[PDB]
From Swiss-Prot:
This is Unsaturated chondroitin disaccharide hydrolase. The lineage of its organism: Bacteria, Bacillati, Bacillota, Bacilli, Lactobacillales. It comes from Streptococcus agalactiae serotype III (strain NEM316). The active site is at residues 114, 155. Induction: Constitutively expressed. Expression level increases in the presence of glycosaminoglycan. Monomer. Optimum pH is 5.5. It catalyses: beta-D-4-deoxy-Delta(4)-GlcpA-(1->3)-beta-D-GalpNAc6S + H2O = N-acetyl-beta-D-galactosamine 6-sulfate + 5-dehydro-4-deoxy-D-glucuronate. Catalyzes the hydrolysis of unsaturated hyaluronate and chondroitin disaccharides. Also degrades unsaturated heparin disaccharides. Releases 4-deoxy-4,5-didehydro D-glucuronic acid or 4-deoxy-4,5-didehydro L-iduronic acid from chondroitin disaccharides, hyaluronan disaccharides and heparin disaccharides and cleaves both glycosidic (1->3) and (1->4) bonds. Prefers sulfated glycosaminoglycans compared to unsulfated glycosaminoglycans. Probably required for mammalian cells invasion through the degradation of extracellular sulfated glycosaminoglycans such as chondroitin and hyaluronan. Ser-345 and Ser-348 bind the sulfated group in the substrate and determine the preference for sulfated glycosaminoglycans compared to unsulfated glycosaminoglycans. Its EC number is 3.2.1.180.
Length: 378
C-alpha cells in the first residue's frame, strides 16, 4: 500500500497569509450569530422539508428528501445545535434523521457516490451528539448499501468516512479494508502527479456511451476544478485519522499548496483554478470553505517541525476571514443562503454564481471548528 509521487510545490509568497490578522473569538461568534439568524429564518421557510442543492437568484427552493445534498441542511442544524444547545434545532434535525431512515429502508433516489454526504452530517452527526439508535441504524444501513455497491471520484474520499465509522461501531474489518483500498485507488487515479485533482472515465469502458449519474465538472481535461481540489484537501486528513500513513500528509501538502498558489488576491478560489483575478469568471466559495475545514483538520496532526505549519494556520484564517467579510449573507430574507457566490455545475449551467447547501454547511463547519473543540461527524 503506497501513494504515487506527486509534485509538492513550495508555498509561493507565504507572507500573503502570514501577515494576516488571526480571527478572534468575537469575529467568529458574530459570523456564527449572523449565519444562525438566517438559519432560524429558513427553518420557518423549509419546515420538515429541504432546500434545493443551489439557490435561484440567491433564494433556495423547497424540496423533498431526494437529492444528494439533503444531509447538508440537517448538518447546518446540528452545527447550530453545537453552538446554542437549542432543542428546537435538535427536534427538527431528528425529524430529518427519521426521514433519512425511511429513505434508506425504501431505497428512494439512492446513489452510492452520495451516501457519505447524505448520512454523515445528518445521521452519524446525531449519533455523535446524543447517541440516538435510529440515527445509528440509518448510518449502518447506508454503510451496508455502500459496501455491496463497491462489491472512482475524489468525492469518494469523503464518502469512505461512512465505512470507517461502520468499522468502529461493528468491529468488522471488512468495512475498513474497502475504505483503505478505495483511499489508495482514489489517490493514485484521481490525483495528477502535479497534485491537481481530476476525474474518472466519463464514458463506459466497454462501449464509450455517455454515462448518467455525473457528466462534467472542471473547465476541461487540462484544468483544475476548485471543489475537486478541495474534496482532496479535506478528504485526505479525514482518511489520515483512520490510517496514520505519513504519505497522506505529503499528498495533503501537494494538494493544498497547489490550491493556495492559485488563490486570487482575496484568497477565495475561482470555480476553476486556472482562473484568477481579471478573468470575469465566478468564484466557488464552497471550495474555499471546504479547504479551510481540511487545513484545520490536518493541523491537528501536522508535526510542529513542519516548516509550513504556521503558514497553513494563517492561510486558513485568511481564507475564512475573506469568506466572512466579503462572501457571507447580509440580506436577512427567507430562503437566502449562508454563503454567496459558489458554482454547482458550470457545464450544465446549474447553480452558477449562486449559494449552495454544501457551501453553507462547510462555511458553518469551519466557523464551529474555529470557535470550539468540535467532535467530528465525519
Amino acid at each position: 500500500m503506497k501513494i504515487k509521487p506527486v509534485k509538492v510545490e513550495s508555498i509561493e509568497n507565504p507572507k500573503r497569509f502570514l501577515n494576516s490578522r488571526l480571527l478572534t473569538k468575537i469575529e467568529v461568534e458574530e459570523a456564527i450569530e449572523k449565519a444562525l439568524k438566517q438559519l432560524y429564518i429558513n427553518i420557518d421557510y423549509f419546515g420538515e422539508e429541504y432546500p434545493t442543492p443551489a439557490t435561484f437568484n440567491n433564494i433556495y427552493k423547497v424540496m423533498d428528501n431526494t437529492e444528494w445534498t439533503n444531509g447538508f441542511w440537517t448538518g447546518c442544524l446540528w452545527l447550530a445545535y453545537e453552538y446554542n444547545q437549542d432543542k428546537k434545532l435538535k427536534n427538527i434535525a431528528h425529524k430529518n434523521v427519521l426521514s433519512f431512515l425511511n429513505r434508506i429502508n425504501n431505497r428512494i433516489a439512492l446513489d452510492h457516490h452520495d451516501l457519505g454526504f447524505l448520512y454523515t452530517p445528518s445521521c452519524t452527526a446525531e449519533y455523535r451528539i446524543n447517541g440516538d439508535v435510529k440515527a445509528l441504524e440509518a448510518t449502518i444501513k447506508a454503510a451496508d448499501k455502500l459496501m455491496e455497491r463497491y462489491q472512482l471520484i475524489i468525492n469518494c474520499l469523503l464518502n469512505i468516512q461512512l465505512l470507517f465509522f461502520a468499522y468502529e461501531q461493528t468491529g468488522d474489518e471488512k468495512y475498513r479494508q474497502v475504505a483503505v483500498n478505495h483511499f489508495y485507488a482514489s489517490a493514485n487515479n484521481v490525483v495528477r502527479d502535479d497534485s491537481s485533482a481530476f476525474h474518472t472515465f466519463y464514458f463506459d469502458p466497454e462501449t464509450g456511451e455517455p454515462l448518467k449519474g455525473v457528466t462534467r465538472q472542471g473547465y476541461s481535461d487540462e484544468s483544475s476544478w476548485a471543489r475537486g481540489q478541495a474534496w482532496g484537501i479535506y478528504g485526505i486528513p479525514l482518511s489520515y485519522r483512520k490510517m496514520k500513513d505519513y504519505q497522506q500528509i505529503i499528498l495533503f501538502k501537494g494538494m493544498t499548496n497547489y490550491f493556495l498558489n492559485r488563490l486570487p488576491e482575496d484568497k477565495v478560489s475561482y470555480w476553476d483554478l486556472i482562473f484568477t483575478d481579471g478573468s470575469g469568471q465566478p468564484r466557488d466559495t464552497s471550495a474555499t470553505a471546504t479547504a479551510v475545514c481540511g487545513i484545520h483538520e490536518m493541523l491537528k496532526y501536522l508535526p510542529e517541525v513542519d516548516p509550513d505549519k504556521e503558514t497553513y494556520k494563517y492561510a486558513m484564517h485568511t481564507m475564512l476571514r475573506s469568506l466572512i467579510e466579503q462572501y457571507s449573507n447580509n440580506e436577512l430574507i427567507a430562503g437566502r443562503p449562508l454563503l454567496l457566490h459558489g458554482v454547482y455545475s458550470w457545464h450544465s449551467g446549474k447553480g452558477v454564481d449562486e449559494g449552495n447547501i454544501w457551501g453553507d454547511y462547510y462555511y458553518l463547519e469551519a466557523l464551529i471548528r474555529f470557535y470550539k473543540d468540535w467532535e467530528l461527524y465525519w
